[PDB]
mmCIF file of C-alpha atoms and ligand atoms in Angstrom:
data_model
loop_
_atom_site.group_PDB
_atom_site.id
_atom_site.type_symbol
_atom_site.label_atom_id
_atom_site.label_comp_id
_atom_site.label_asym_id
_atom_site.label_seq_id
_atom_site.Cartn_x
_atom_site.Cartn_y
_atom_site.Cartn_z
ATOM 1 C CA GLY L 1 8.953 77.765 -28.267
ATOM 2 C CA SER L 2 8.105 76.940 -24.666
ATOM 3 C CA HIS L 3 6.662 73.667 -23.392
ATOM 4 C CA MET L 4 3.433 73.727 -21.346
ATOM 5 C CA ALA L 5 2.894 70.429 -19.544
ATOM 6 C CA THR L 6 -0.605 69.042 -19.048
ATOM 7 C CA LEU L 7 -1.007 67.368 -15.637
ATOM 8 C CA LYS L 8 -4.017 65.182 -14.884
ATOM 9 C CA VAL L 9 -5.195 63.496 -11.691
ATOM 10 C CA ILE L 10 -7.383 60.413 -12.160
ATOM 11 C CA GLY L 11 -9.408 58.955 -9.305
ATOM 12 C CA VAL L 12 -10.289 55.271 -9.670
ATOM 13 C CA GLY L 13 -12.865 53.758 -7.330
ATOM 14 C CA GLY L 14 -14.289 55.160 -4.131
ATOM 15 C CA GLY L 15 -11.211 56.302 -2.277
ATOM 16 C CA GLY L 16 -9.545 57.715 -5.360
ATOM 17 C CA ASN L 17 -12.606 59.741 -6.261
ATOM 18 C CA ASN L 18 -12.891 60.900 -2.658
ATOM 19 C CA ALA L 19 -9.365 62.246 -2.953
ATOM 20 C CA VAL L 20 -10.243 63.940 -6.241
ATOM 21 C CA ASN L 21 -13.334 65.562 -4.742
ATOM 22 C CA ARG L 22 -11.417 66.834 -1.705
ATOM 23 C CA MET L 23 -8.622 68.196 -3.908
ATOM 24 C CA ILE L 24 -11.079 70.093 -6.088
ATOM 25 C CA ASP L 25 -12.723 71.443 -2.925
ATOM 26 C CA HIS L 26 -9.351 72.530 -1.529
ATOM 27 C CA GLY L 27 -8.766 74.321 -4.829
ATOM 28 C CA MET L 28 -6.275 73.249 -7.471
ATOM 29 C CA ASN L 29 -5.257 75.244 -10.540
ATOM 30 C CA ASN L 30 -3.713 74.144 -13.848
ATOM 31 C CA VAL L 31 -4.530 70.481 -13.111
ATOM 32 C CA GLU L 32 -7.274 68.498 -14.833
ATOM 33 C CA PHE L 33 -9.303 65.864 -13.021
ATOM 34 C CA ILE L 34 -10.860 62.646 -14.250
ATOM 35 C CA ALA L 35 -13.226 60.507 -12.162
ATOM 36 C CA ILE L 36 -13.478 56.792 -13.017
ATOM 37 C CA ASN L 37 -15.841 54.498 -11.158
ATOM 38 C CA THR L 38 -18.185 51.556 -11.404
ATOM 39 C CA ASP L 39 -20.397 53.078 -8.665
ATOM 40 C CA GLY L 40 -22.831 55.342 -10.465
ATOM 41 C CA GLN L 41 -24.251 56.797 -7.233
ATOM 42 C CA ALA L 42 -20.858 58.044 -6.114
ATOM 43 C CA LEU L 43 -19.851 59.123 -9.620
ATOM 44 C CA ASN L 44 -22.956 61.317 -9.857
ATOM 45 C CA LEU L 45 -21.586 63.273 -6.863
ATOM 46 C CA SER L 46 -18.116 63.744 -8.357
ATOM 47 C CA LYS L 47 -16.872 67.317 -8.790
ATOM 48 C CA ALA L 48 -14.547 66.262 -11.635
ATOM 49 C CA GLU L 49 -15.040 67.848 -15.065
ATOM 50 C CA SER L 50 -14.532 64.485 -16.815
ATOM 51 C CA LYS L 51 -16.421 61.428 -15.533
ATOM 52 C CA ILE L 52 -16.226 57.851 -16.823
ATOM 53 C CA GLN L 53 -18.612 55.179 -15.569
ATOM 54 C CA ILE L 54 -17.028 51.792 -16.241
ATOM 55 C CA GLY L 55 -18.539 48.317 -16.146
ATOM 56 C CA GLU L 56 -22.221 49.220 -16.222
ATOM 57 C CA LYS L 57 -22.857 46.023 -18.209
ATOM 58 C CA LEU L 58 -21.095 44.053 -15.467
ATOM 59 C CA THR L 59 -22.412 45.757 -12.305
ATOM 60 C CA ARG L 60 -25.678 47.456 -13.397
ATOM 61 C CA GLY L 61 -24.291 50.727 -12.039
ATOM 62 C CA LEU L 62 -23.125 49.345 -8.701
ATOM 63 C CA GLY L 63 -19.594 48.942 -7.454
ATOM 64 C CA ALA L 64 -17.605 45.756 -8.067
ATOM 65 C CA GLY L 65 -18.465 44.307 -4.637
ATOM 66 C CA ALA L 66 -14.806 43.766 -3.738
ATOM 67 C CA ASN L 67 -14.159 41.691 -6.865
ATOM 68 C CA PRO L 68 -10.950 42.883 -8.573
ATOM 69 C CA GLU L 69 -11.493 40.804 -11.695
ATOM 70 C CA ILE L 70 -14.685 42.799 -12.307
ATOM 71 C CA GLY L 71 -12.836 46.071 -11.755
ATOM 72 C CA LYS L 72 -10.132 44.985 -14.202
ATOM 73 C CA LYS L 73 -12.613 43.880 -16.858
ATOM 74 C CA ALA L 74 -14.673 47.059 -16.389
ATOM 75 C CA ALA L 75 -11.651 49.236 -17.116
ATOM 76 C CA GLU L 76 -10.517 47.110 -20.085
ATOM 77 C CA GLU L 77 -13.966 47.316 -21.673
ATOM 78 C CA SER L 78 -13.864 51.135 -21.380
ATOM 79 C CA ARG L 79 -10.292 51.472 -22.684
ATOM 80 C CA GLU L 80 -11.262 53.815 -25.551
ATOM 81 C CA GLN L 81 -13.190 56.195 -23.263
ATOM 82 C CA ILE L 82 -10.256 56.256 -20.846
ATOM 83 C CA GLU L 83 -7.780 56.881 -23.689
ATOM 84 C CA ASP L 84 -9.946 59.760 -24.953
ATOM 85 C CA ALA L 85 -10.049 61.445 -21.534
ATOM 86 C CA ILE L 86 -6.289 61.095 -21.013
ATOM 87 C CA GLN L 87 -5.179 62.083 -24.516
ATOM 88 C CA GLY L 88 -2.836 65.070 -24.361
ATOM 89 C CA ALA L 89 -1.646 64.460 -20.800
ATOM 90 C CA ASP L 90 2.076 64.780 -20.248
ATOM 91 C CA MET L 91 1.778 63.491 -16.679
ATOM 92 C CA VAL L 92 -0.952 61.454 -14.997
ATOM 93 C CA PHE L 93 -1.413 60.752 -11.291
ATOM 94 C CA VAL L 94 -3.621 57.677 -10.718
ATOM 95 C CA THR L 95 -4.998 57.628 -7.194
ATOM 96 C CA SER L 96 -6.920 54.733 -5.768
ATOM 97 C CA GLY L 97 -7.577 52.801 -2.584
ATOM 98 C CA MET L 98 -6.399 49.210 -2.844
ATOM 99 C CA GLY L 99 -8.270 46.215 -1.390
ATOM 100 C CA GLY L 100 -11.700 46.422 -3.009
ATOM 101 C CA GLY L 101 -12.632 45.502 -6.546
ATOM 102 C CA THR L 102 -12.808 48.687 -8.584
ATOM 103 C CA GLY L 103 -9.619 50.303 -7.305
ATOM 104 C CA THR L 104 -7.575 47.110 -7.059
ATOM 105 C CA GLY L 105 -8.604 45.906 -10.513
ATOM 106 C CA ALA L 106 -9.157 49.053 -12.550
ATOM 107 C CA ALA L 107 -6.387 51.370 -11.315
ATOM 108 C CA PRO L 108 -3.547 49.252 -12.827
ATOM 109 C CA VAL L 109 -5.442 49.198 -16.127
ATOM 110 C CA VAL L 110 -5.896 52.977 -16.070
ATOM 111 C CA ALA L 111 -2.196 53.412 -15.313
ATOM 112 C CA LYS L 112 -1.196 51.055 -18.130
ATOM 113 C CA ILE L 113 -3.377 53.021 -20.539
ATOM 114 C CA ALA L 114 -1.875 56.345 -19.422
ATOM 115 C CA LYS L 115 1.689 55.126 -19.929
ATOM 116 C CA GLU L 116 0.784 53.695 -23.336
ATOM 117 C CA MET L 117 -0.709 57.105 -24.229
ATOM 118 C CA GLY L 118 2.741 58.577 -23.493
ATOM 119 C CA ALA L 119 2.128 60.134 -20.107
ATOM 120 C CA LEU L 120 4.567 59.995 -17.249
ATOM 121 C CA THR L 121 2.432 57.903 -14.886
ATOM 122 C CA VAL L 122 2.578 58.112 -11.089
ATOM 123 C CA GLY L 123 0.412 55.952 -8.849
ATOM 124 C CA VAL L 124 -0.583 57.151 -5.384
ATOM 125 C CA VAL L 125 -2.492 54.364 -3.625
ATOM 126 C CA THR L 126 -3.504 53.331 -0.105
ATOM 127 C CA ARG L 127 -3.272 49.928 1.599
ATOM 128 C CA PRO L 128 -6.226 49.045 3.839
ATOM 129 C CA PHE L 129 -6.368 49.382 7.591
ATOM 130 C CA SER L 130 -5.434 46.235 9.484
ATOM 131 C CA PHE L 131 -8.910 46.270 11.054
ATOM 132 C CA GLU L 132 -10.312 45.571 7.567
ATOM 133 C CA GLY L 133 -8.832 42.061 7.804
ATOM 134 C CA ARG L 134 -6.300 39.835 6.104
ATOM 135 C CA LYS L 135 -8.260 39.148 2.909
ATOM 136 C CA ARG L 136 -8.546 42.877 2.173
ATOM 137 C CA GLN L 137 -4.815 43.263 2.851
ATOM 138 C CA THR L 138 -3.878 40.350 0.570
ATOM 139 C CA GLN L 139 -6.103 41.639 -2.229
ATOM 140 C CA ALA L 140 -4.595 45.098 -1.796
ATOM 141 C CA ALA L 141 -1.108 43.636 -2.027
ATOM 142 C CA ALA L 142 -1.932 42.115 -5.413
ATOM 143 C CA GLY L 143 -3.225 45.501 -6.495
ATOM 144 C CA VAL L 144 -0.041 47.227 -5.354
ATOM 145 C CA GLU L 145 2.090 44.735 -7.284
ATOM 146 C CA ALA L 146 -0.057 45.259 -10.397
ATOM 147 C CA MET L 147 0.231 49.031 -9.959
ATOM 148 C CA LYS L 148 4.017 48.718 -9.714
ATOM 149 C CA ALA L 149 4.111 46.851 -13.012
ATOM 150 C CA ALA L 150 1.997 49.503 -14.723
ATOM 151 C CA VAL L 151 3.299 52.882 -13.488
ATOM 152 C CA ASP L 152 6.527 54.811 -13.884
ATOM 153 C CA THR L 153 6.620 55.463 -10.132
ATOM 154 C CA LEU L 154 4.496 54.423 -7.180
ATOM 155 C CA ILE L 155 3.746 56.001 -3.794
ATOM 156 C CA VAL L 156 2.046 53.717 -1.275
ATOM 157 C CA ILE L 157 0.263 55.083 1.807
ATOM 158 C CA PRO L 158 -0.592 52.331 4.334
ATOM 159 C CA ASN L 159 -3.797 53.546 5.961
ATOM 160 C CA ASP L 160 -2.537 52.141 9.284
ATOM 161 C CA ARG L 161 -0.082 55.053 9.329
ATOM 162 C CA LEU L 162 -3.021 57.417 9.807
ATOM 163 C CA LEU L 163 -3.401 55.836 13.257
ATOM 164 C CA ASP L 164 0.049 57.255 14.032
ATOM 165 C CA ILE L 165 -0.990 60.874 13.392
ATOM 166 C CA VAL L 166 -4.447 61.058 15.009
ATOM 167 C CA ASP L 167 -5.516 61.441 18.598
ATOM 168 C CA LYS L 168 -8.531 59.554 19.905
ATOM 169 C CA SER L 169 -10.905 62.270 18.674
ATOM 170 C CA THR L 170 -9.452 63.343 15.310
ATOM 171 C CA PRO L 171 -12.335 63.137 12.804
ATOM 172 C CA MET L 172 -11.901 60.419 10.198
ATOM 173 C CA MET L 173 -12.357 63.010 7.441
ATOM 174 C CA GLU L 174 -9.515 65.111 8.873
ATOM 175 C CA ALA L 175 -7.277 62.037 8.873
ATOM 176 C CA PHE L 176 -8.212 61.323 5.264
ATOM 177 C CA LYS L 177 -7.280 64.889 4.352
ATOM 178 C CA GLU L 178 -3.768 64.263 5.756
ATOM 179 C CA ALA L 179 -3.373 61.286 3.421
ATOM 180 C CA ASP L 180 -4.749 63.429 0.577
ATOM 181 C CA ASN L 181 -1.947 65.946 1.138
ATOM 182 C CA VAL L 182 0.640 63.477 -0.107
ATOM 183 C CA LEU L 183 -0.916 63.559 -3.570
ATOM 184 C CA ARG L 184 -2.036 67.193 -3.500
ATOM 185 C CA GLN L 185 1.288 68.674 -2.436
ATOM 186 C CA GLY L 186 3.239 66.489 -4.859
ATOM 187 C CA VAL L 187 1.010 67.519 -7.754
ATOM 188 C CA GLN L 188 1.084 71.157 -6.673
ATOM 189 C CA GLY L 189 4.851 71.023 -6.255
ATOM 190 C CA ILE L 190 5.404 69.758 -9.791
ATOM 191 C CA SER L 191 2.887 72.219 -11.203
ATOM 192 C CA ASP L 192 4.654 75.121 -9.499
ATOM 193 C CA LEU L 193 8.076 73.872 -10.516
ATOM 194 C CA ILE L 194 6.950 73.812 -14.166
ATOM 195 C CA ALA L 195 5.173 77.158 -14.114
ATOM 196 C CA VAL L 196 7.951 79.250 -12.607
ATOM 197 C CA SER L 197 11.226 80.258 -14.201
ATOM 198 C CA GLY L 198 14.038 79.431 -11.783
ATOM 199 C CA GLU L 199 17.464 80.949 -11.283
ATOM 200 C CA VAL L 200 18.699 77.375 -11.643
ATOM 201 C CA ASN L 201 15.762 76.178 -13.721
ATOM 202 C CA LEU L 202 14.137 72.767 -13.402
ATOM 203 C CA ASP L 203 11.477 71.627 -15.828
ATOM 204 C CA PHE L 204 9.358 68.688 -16.867
ATOM 205 C CA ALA L 205 12.278 66.937 -18.586
ATOM 206 C CA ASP L 206 14.012 66.796 -15.193
ATOM 207 C CA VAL L 207 10.841 65.318 -13.675
ATOM 208 C CA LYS L 208 10.800 62.676 -16.411
ATOM 209 C CA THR L 209 14.455 61.818 -15.822
ATOM 210 C CA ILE L 210 13.921 61.324 -12.090
ATOM 211 C CA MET L 211 10.563 59.526 -12.302
ATOM 212 C CA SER L 212 10.465 57.507 -15.544
ATOM 213 C CA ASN L 213 10.513 53.744 -14.960
ATOM 214 C CA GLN L 214 11.889 54.123 -11.431
ATOM 215 C CA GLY L 215 9.678 52.004 -9.126
ATOM 216 C CA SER L 216 9.007 53.391 -5.667
ATOM 217 C CA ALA L 217 8.990 57.118 -5.051
ATOM 218 C CA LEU L 218 8.781 59.866 -2.472
ATOM 219 C CA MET L 219 7.337 63.332 -3.125
ATOM 220 C CA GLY L 220 7.527 65.901 -0.355
ATOM 221 C CA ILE L 221 7.432 69.593 0.419
ATOM 222 C CA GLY L 222 8.754 71.400 3.458
ATOM 223 C CA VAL L 223 8.307 75.029 4.465
ATOM 224 C CA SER L 224 10.169 76.839 7.215
ATOM 225 C CA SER L 225 11.321 80.255 8.367
ATOM 226 C CA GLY L 226 13.832 81.724 10.774
ATOM 227 C CA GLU L 227 17.018 80.173 12.069
ATOM 228 C CA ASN L 228 17.959 76.841 10.533
ATOM 229 C CA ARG L 229 15.106 77.296 8.045
ATOM 230 C CA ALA L 230 16.841 75.442 5.184
ATOM 231 C CA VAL L 231 17.624 72.378 7.302
ATOM 232 C CA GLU L 232 14.139 72.388 8.820
ATOM 233 C CA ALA L 233 12.370 72.682 5.470
ATOM 234 C CA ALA L 234 14.546 69.923 3.973
ATOM 235 C CA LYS L 235 13.807 67.574 6.889
ATOM 236 C CA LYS L 236 10.065 68.242 6.536
ATOM 237 C CA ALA L 237 10.226 67.561 2.787
ATOM 238 C CA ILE L 238 11.665 64.065 3.371
ATOM 239 C CA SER L 239 9.650 63.161 6.479
ATOM 240 C CA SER L 240 7.464 60.216 5.541
ATOM 241 C CA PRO L 241 5.152 59.435 8.479
ATOM 242 C CA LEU L 242 2.449 58.232 6.085
ATOM 243 C CA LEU L 243 4.736 56.649 3.482
ATOM 244 C CA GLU L 244 5.746 53.050 2.945
ATOM 245 C CA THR L 245 8.794 54.281 0.992
ATOM 246 C CA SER L 246 11.070 56.538 3.035
ATOM 247 C CA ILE L 247 13.996 58.575 1.720
ATOM 248 C CA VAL L 248 16.486 55.962 2.930
ATOM 249 C CA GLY L 249 18.191 54.385 -0.074
ATOM 250 C CA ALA L 250 17.136 56.956 -2.666
ATOM 251 C CA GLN L 251 19.486 57.135 -5.645
ATOM 252 C CA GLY L 252 17.881 59.894 -7.715
ATOM 253 C CA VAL L 253 16.517 63.167 -6.400
ATOM 254 C CA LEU L 254 14.923 66.247 -7.889
ATOM 255 C CA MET L 255 15.364 68.969 -5.279
ATOM 256 C CA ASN L 256 14.203 72.550 -5.616
ATOM 257 C CA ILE L 257 14.693 75.380 -3.132
ATOM 258 C CA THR L 258 12.488 78.478 -3.320
ATOM 259 C CA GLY L 259 13.206 81.513 -1.194
ATOM 260 C CA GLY L 260 13.401 85.275 -1.274
ATOM 261 C CA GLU L 261 16.424 87.365 -2.109
ATOM 262 C CA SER L 262 18.043 86.360 1.208
ATOM 263 C CA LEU L 263 18.456 82.729 0.052
ATOM 264 C CA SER L 264 22.086 81.926 0.786
ATOM 265 C CA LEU L 265 24.454 79.551 -0.942
ATOM 266 C CA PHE L 266 25.432 78.144 2.454
ATOM 267 C CA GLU L 267 21.868 77.174 3.383
ATOM 268 C CA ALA L 268 21.262 75.631 -0.053
ATOM 269 C CA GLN L 269 24.233 73.358 0.622
ATOM 270 C CA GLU L 270 22.865 72.623 4.107
ATOM 271 C CA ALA L 271 19.554 71.501 2.649
ATOM 272 C CA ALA L 272 21.139 69.416 -0.096
ATOM 273 C CA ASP L 273 23.379 67.766 2.504
ATOM 274 C CA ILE L 274 20.333 66.818 4.630
ATOM 275 C CA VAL L 275 18.873 64.945 1.655
ATOM 276 C CA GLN L 276 22.198 63.343 0.700
ATOM 277 C CA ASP L 277 22.832 62.210 4.283
ATOM 278 C CA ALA L 278 19.296 60.926 4.938
ATOM 279 C CA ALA L 279 19.358 58.884 1.728
ATOM 280 C CA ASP L 280 22.497 57.221 3.083
ATOM 281 C CA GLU L 281 23.399 56.661 -0.580
ATOM 282 C CA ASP L 282 25.336 58.537 -3.207
ATOM 283 C CA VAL L 283 22.305 60.334 -4.648
ATOM 284 C CA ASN L 284 22.192 61.564 -8.276
ATOM 285 C CA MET L 285 20.653 64.997 -7.685
ATOM 286 C CA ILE L 286 19.086 67.462 -10.098
ATOM 287 C CA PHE L 287 19.187 70.658 -8.037
ATOM 288 C CA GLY L 288 17.224 73.823 -8.726
ATOM 289 C CA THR L 289 16.620 77.206 -7.152
ATOM 290 C CA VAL L 290 13.862 79.797 -7.452
ATOM 291 C CA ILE L 291 14.102 83.313 -6.073
ATOM 292 C CA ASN L 292 10.628 84.638 -5.217
ATOM 293 C CA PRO L 293 11.005 88.208 -3.888
ATOM 294 C CA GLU L 294 7.452 88.115 -2.513
ATOM 295 C CA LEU L 295 8.840 85.749 0.112
ATOM 296 C CA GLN L 296 10.461 87.326 3.147
ATOM 297 C CA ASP L 297 11.928 84.788 5.616
ATOM 298 C CA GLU L 298 10.081 81.750 4.218
ATOM 299 C CA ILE L 299 11.895 78.937 2.415
ATOM 300 C CA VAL L 300 10.294 76.062 0.519
ATOM 301 C CA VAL L 301 12.080 72.799 -0.271
ATOM 302 C CA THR L 302 10.591 70.372 -2.806
ATOM 303 C CA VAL L 303 11.929 66.815 -3.062
ATOM 304 C CA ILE L 304 11.165 63.987 -5.471
ATOM 305 C CA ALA L 305 13.158 60.849 -4.630
ATOM 306 C CA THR L 306 13.406 57.602 -6.619
ATOM 307 C CA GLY L 307 15.990 54.896 -7.337
ATOM 308 C CA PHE L 308 15.461 52.585 -4.370
HETATM 309 N N1 GCP H 1 -7.177 57.177 3.082
HETATM 310 C C1 GCP H 1 -8.397 56.716 2.497
HETATM 311 N N2 GCP H 1 -8.653 55.412 2.323
HETATM 312 C C2 GCP H 1 -9.850 55.119 1.749
HETATM 313 C C3 GCP H 1 -10.728 56.070 1.371
HETATM 314 N N3 GCP H 1 -11.808 55.419 0.852
HETATM 315 C C4 GCP H 1 -11.540 54.090 0.888
HETATM 316 N N4 GCP H 1 -10.350 53.909 1.478
HETATM 317 C C5 GCP H 1 -9.629 52.665 1.713
HETATM 318 O O1 GCP H 1 -9.533 52.082 0.193
HETATM 319 C C6 GCP H 1 -10.007 50.831 0.207
HETATM 320 C C7 GCP H 1 -10.920 50.518 -0.999
HETATM 321 O O2 GCP H 1 -12.076 51.310 -0.846
HETATM 322 P P1 GCP H 1 -12.765 51.904 -2.202
HETATM 323 O O3 GCP H 1 -11.799 52.834 -2.913
HETATM 324 O O4 GCP H 1 -14.130 52.478 -1.878
HETATM 325 O O5 GCP H 1 -12.934 50.544 -3.012
HETATM 326 P P2 GCP H 1 -13.652 50.242 -4.428
HETATM 327 O O6 GCP H 1 -12.703 49.346 -5.157
HETATM 328 O O7 GCP H 1 -14.117 51.499 -5.073
HETATM 329 C C8 GCP H 1 -15.114 49.356 -3.780
HETATM 330 P P3 GCP H 1 -15.904 48.112 -4.879
HETATM 331 O O8 GCP H 1 -15.089 46.856 -4.801
HETATM 332 O O9 GCP H 1 -17.254 47.725 -4.326
HETATM 333 O O10 GCP H 1 -16.095 48.700 -6.228
HETATM 334 C C9 GCP H 1 -10.787 50.678 1.518
HETATM 335 O O11 GCP H 1 -10.689 49.389 1.958
HETATM 336 C C10 GCP H 1 -10.081 51.673 2.428
HETATM 337 O O12 GCP H 1 -8.840 51.010 2.970
HETATM 338 C C11 GCP H 1 -10.426 57.401 1.575
HETATM 339 O O13 GCP H 1 -11.118 58.341 1.250
HETATM 340 N N5 GCP H 1 -9.264 57.691 2.125
HETATM 341 K K1 K H 2 10.633 75.864 -14.263
#
């Protein structure tokens, strides 16, 4: 028969659960959410269907107070509850802000558990703003290294990059939604790739080949119309204003192109060439195509890049 992949998104700590709440608000389908936190006040406000309060014996229901050893121990002591919530997942996205205690310490434990439960495990984490100081940055760096050791693939968003995309008045919440989009569009892109039957079909086994045990990653989506649409969508898919890891140096790529019946062979080559040339490597590509006749002049390019 057919395979139906279960995708889960797990928020760990404040920032991660913020991202989960905003994704649920934005509306996601076919994805399951898990909220993990020490902070009982924030966890009570989570919109996630599955909630795990960790470390209550250690924190009395408070956060970890920037102590990553308490975050790590809190997750370890709730291993069975975390395993039970994950069980059945084919793919898990662990999202977390690094630099505090709960996210820094517990997110690598959650990711380790997910991988041991058999899930393809992707971390999407932030580094703190420079204005938060050097100690926060150093602690975050230890969290990023622990994440790298625990996940299949890791996407790092330095929060300082948000300062590159705001004007002096952009609300902080609007900026945070831009960082959220990295996770949301990557999850949505995989979900859609799985759900739809393509003319050149890609599926979850291709995602596993490109992402399993591959270190840093990029996940992007680009949409364009009109003249040069394939080139423009491909460039947008690989544009990484918020990413620590750019496309440069990628050695494996999952690339899908969705368009209407006008989708031309020539423009599919144009788009593939953009990704090959930007990588500035010989990229091992798994290429797919979907014809969606509901589309008119719109083209959508999805890119997952690993192998740096
Ligand atoms: N882009 C973004 N960054 C966030 C968000 N919330 C927190 N951050 C950033 O993540 C870092 C850690 O914050 P948070 O996730 O609340 O930490 P925690 O580990 O839960 C806090 P404690 O140590 O007390 O338990 C912050 O220093 C900040 O850089 C958010 O919603 N969006
Ligand atoms: K498919």
